[PDB]
Amino acid sequence: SPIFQGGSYQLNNKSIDISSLLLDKLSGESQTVVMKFKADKPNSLQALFGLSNSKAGFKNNYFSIFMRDSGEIGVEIRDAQKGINYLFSRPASLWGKHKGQAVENTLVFVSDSKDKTYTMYVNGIEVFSETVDTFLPISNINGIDKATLGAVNREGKEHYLAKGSIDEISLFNKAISDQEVSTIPLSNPFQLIFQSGDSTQANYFRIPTLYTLSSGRVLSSIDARYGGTHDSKSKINIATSYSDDNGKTWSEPIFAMKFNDYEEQLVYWPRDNKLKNSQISGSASFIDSSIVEDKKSGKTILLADVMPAGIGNNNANKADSGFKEINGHYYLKLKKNGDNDFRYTVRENGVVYNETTNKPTNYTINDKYEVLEGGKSLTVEQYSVDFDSGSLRERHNGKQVPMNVFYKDSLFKVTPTNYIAMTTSQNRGESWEQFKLLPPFLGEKHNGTYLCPGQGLALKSSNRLIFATYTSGELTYLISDDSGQTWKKSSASIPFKNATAEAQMVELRDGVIRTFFRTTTGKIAYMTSRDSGETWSKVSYIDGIQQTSYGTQVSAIKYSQLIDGKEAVILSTPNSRSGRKGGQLVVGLVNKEDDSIDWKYHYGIDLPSYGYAYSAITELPNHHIGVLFEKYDSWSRNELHLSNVVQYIDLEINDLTKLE
Ligand SMILES: O=C(NCc1cccc(F)c1Cl)[C@H]1C[C@@H](O)[C@@H](O)C1
């Protein structure tokens, strides 16, 4: 039932005129275009499809579907006599190549006069949906007389010439419904694990992790980010999902760590330049998770940073751990409403103690960090957010929730600094315990170290668990030998002031750990422990891979099979000095003479100019590699607040080992 349909069009910098097939068939004020297309070597800006007034003097009368070589997709809708110049677009909307082949993107653009709405979907993902006061039907642009593929005809000349191919293009004289859109067959090279409108109700995701458990279950954790893609301060929860079939399907997400001071709301965070720094500023949050499995207990263990209400990296108190040390014991300090200082601590059995009178009060803190008085739950009122008034407002919403010491409205509040929490699961990610704060590791006058997102390390020959953390001047490895019950630190100095030194570890051979880490120098650095993490070498650098000056998280595994008869390490990282893009897997072979690594093969995840930021990698039970990664430039200010860009792909070793 499409009014029009064609395919196998090659776009070789030369437009194709389809006026006579299509213009008499455009009818009514609602259209849907479906286009299956490849573009592995796009020009930097190019039109896929144009409808225009091609006459002299009317060069601003046209509709276009366009793309950029950054993977942005968009439309223009312009009519100079109506005074309308609409431009809707979204960065990071496309695939270029996957496993050495051009990906067939499936684009669906709906121009709906009844709802006065334009909506674009690419690869089954809605990338923008905009309602306007004055609707411009694409067939009502004054004086339209050309339909073009691979350019726009303006005043009789080609503009926005494209390189690529349109395998299939269909047009309907209807705005097809959301549900109809979901039945169009896709040829996606990826899938989604977490996604907008799923059970987390977060419209944004960042910071993916992956870990293959001994049962063969693959577990994933992620920041479910509510206030757009911003780091804390914000509302962010830690959500998890697992796959029992080698990553073919994933479970509905659950929370590993969550706060209820603010509602879980699916919000379209504004992307206009004036409002995109809107940031939820009154919520507690979690940020940056890391997962490991314990062979001893069989438990799965998840750590994350915890931010009290309104706190994030740049306002956290850098000179307070938030605990009071009492002879080898650390007690969580509290400040009561109205006091100017912290006159309280939480003792054994959650008893809240007045440090001034050395006497217990009638308040206790339960296992959820909620405030009890004489055994009874105190509540606060929950907040929601809205942009109804034109800017961000955070406001009480009439619902009551348990009063928590991390919350803005609590009677008793923790130190405004960052913490590290842990949770565990006894059933491999089907549910999670209530979180517990880890102790402070660097004394009373030092904020928490920052958890390195991704995987912890479980040593092959012992029961030792290691989580990498970073702080100013050092990596701080957190080490447990009793299933997470107690912890010590091993500090390893690094020659950096204030670096975001995100680090991931591989066990090269028994008791030998190599840690790769992000720096401020444009190179990925590494250091080595030969005593299962007790002590660490000086720092060296990998030449051969580039990052930007500010750096990006790198994920790393030791592969279980030999490759070219040698043991192998796989790294995942952008490889570019310009931005977070040019994503690669790099396969290094270990030289058994000295534990040095020859980086030998680099696989491009997609085009050098397409987004690739934080990433997670794991060897699947069947020896494929699972990659869950941010497919966008998560540093760029133009790419903030994008939905469904954290995506999962499956690769085999033979995919990686061309080329050298
Ligand atoms: O058990 C690990 N690697 C071994 C492994 C994974 C998949 C298939 C295998 F045959 C093996 Cl040995 C750890 C699991 C975590 O995800 C770490 O990346 C490596």
UniProtKB/Swiss-Prot annotation:
UniProt keyword list: Glycosidase, Hydrolase, Repeat, Signal
Cellular component annotations (GO), alphabetically ordered: cytoplasm; intracellular membrane-bounded organelle; membrane
UniProt cross-references to CDD domains, sorted A to Z: Sialidase_non-viral
Residues reported in the UniProt entry to bind substrate: 206, 518, 580
InterPro entries per the UniProt record, alphabetical: BNR_rpt (IPR002860), ConA-like_dom_sf (IPR013320), Glyco_hydro_33_N (IPR004124), Sialidase (IPR011040), Sialidase_fam (IPR026856), Sialidase_sf (IPR036278), Trans_sialidase_dom3 (IPR023364)
Signal in keyword set: yes
Gene Ontology MF terms in the entry: exo-alpha-sialidase activity
Name assigned to this protein: Sialidase B
Biological classification of the source: Bacteria, Bacillati, Bacillota, Bacilli, Lactobacillales
Gene that encodes it: nanB
